[PDB]
């Protein structure tokens, strides 16, 4: 089905949506230092939101551009970084924010991923970082700029 | 399809899940005062999580019981409240936590819902509170104790 199609580069990132038309994530809507948003890729032609495949679940956050690791910075757009939100431990959605670390927290077993340093695991049992998705801005809007730089989710 | 069935009383609450087997939310995992978790209802016997219907999207948080408004506490289980996470403004998932207010925040246009006082709108444009889901504990696991108390999401 179109809703279960994988993320492709050029997909528009949209805020996680309940019913109705989706909202593209604009750069100007993300304030540096604010908690991440959960996001999905939307086919730029068909405008189908690929929210039916859980491997397309994203977290998106704006950091101070001079706080990002050089390796993280090269895939960021104006301090904006995106990562897979599928926990690498047992596949829970990494849905919570740790304010003092500016890290992503998994509620299931306390996995914490250090986002400014490539989502390095700094707590709990994830065996590996969630992978980063390359982002770019086009006409004010966040767009997927590449494939995930890594396998998504629980890897057998 | 079964992943799209509406939420029913008796459904087990599970942590939002990528691929794979879901994790029931147990009362003991929820620390009073911690940010909410995004969740879905799961059929107790078939073990089908109803996450393909976005109107089943829940937020779950544990409060100090004596800070809940009387009406809210009537449908809480040892301080744990659940609400629909579909924004009543334009349908975005209410996915963020406001730590100083203990409030759920919609990132689309800044709707903020006062969880301890029945998800009362305290910022942004939502026309009305997200509705509460009554919850109870069954063998240490969080379960739907009734139906959503009002209509879910954007009014049609
Ligand atoms: S599934 Fe995320 S820490 Fe276990
Ligand atoms: S959709 Fe939540 S404030 Fe607009
Ligand atoms: Ca503008
Ligand atoms: Ca126990
Ligand atoms: Pr449409
Ligand atoms: Pr910082
Ligand atoms: Pr700076
Ligand atoms: Pr490089
Ligand atoms: Pr253009
Ligand atoms: Pr019983």
Provide key terms for this protein.
homodimer; 156 residues; mainly beta; Rieske Iron-sulfur Protein; five-stranded antiparallel sheet; four-stranded antiparallel sheet; binds FE2/S2 (inorganic) cluster; binds calcium ion; binds praseodymium ion; disulfide bond (chains A, B); Quinol-cytochrome c reductase, Rieske iron-sulfur subunit (chains A, B)
Sequence-ordered SSE layout with sheet pairings:
The structure is a homodimer of 156-residue chains.
Chain A: E1 12-15, E2 37-42, E3 58-62, H1 70-73, E4 80-84, E5 96-98, E6 103-105, E7 112-114, E8 120-123, E9 132-133, E10 135-138, E11 141-144
Antiparallel strand pairs in A: 1-2, 2-3, 3-4, 4-9, 5-6, 6-7, 7-8, 10-11
Bound molecules: FE2/S2 (inorganic) cluster (2 copies), calcium ion (2 copies) and praseodymium ion (6 copies).
PDB class: electron transport
Keywords: Rieske protein, Pr, [2Fe-2S], electron transport
Assembly: dimeric
State the gist of this model.
The PDB classes it as electron transport. The structure is a homodimer of 156-residue chains. The first copy, chain A, has 156 residues and is mainly β.
């Amino acid at each position: 089905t179109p809703e279960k199609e994988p993320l492709k580069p050029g997909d528009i990132l949209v805020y996680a949506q309940g019913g109705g038309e989706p909202k593209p994530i604009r750069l100007e809507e993300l304030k540096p230092g604010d908690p991440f948003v959960l996001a999905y890729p939307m086919d730029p032609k068909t405008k189908v939101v690929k929210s039916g495949e859980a491997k397309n679940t994203l977290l998106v956050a704006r950091f101070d551009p001079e706080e990002l690791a050089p390796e993280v910075a090269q895939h960021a757009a104006e301090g904006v970084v995106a990562y897979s939100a599928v926990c690498t431990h047992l596949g829970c959605i990494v849905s919570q924010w740790v304010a003092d670390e500016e890290a992503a927290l998994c509620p299931c077993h306390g996995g914490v991923y250090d986002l400014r340093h490539g989502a390095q695991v700094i707590a709990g049992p994830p065996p590996r970082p969630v992978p980063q998705l390359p982002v770019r801005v086009e006409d004010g809007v966040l767009v997927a700029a590449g494939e995930f730089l890594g396998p998504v989710g629980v890897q057998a």
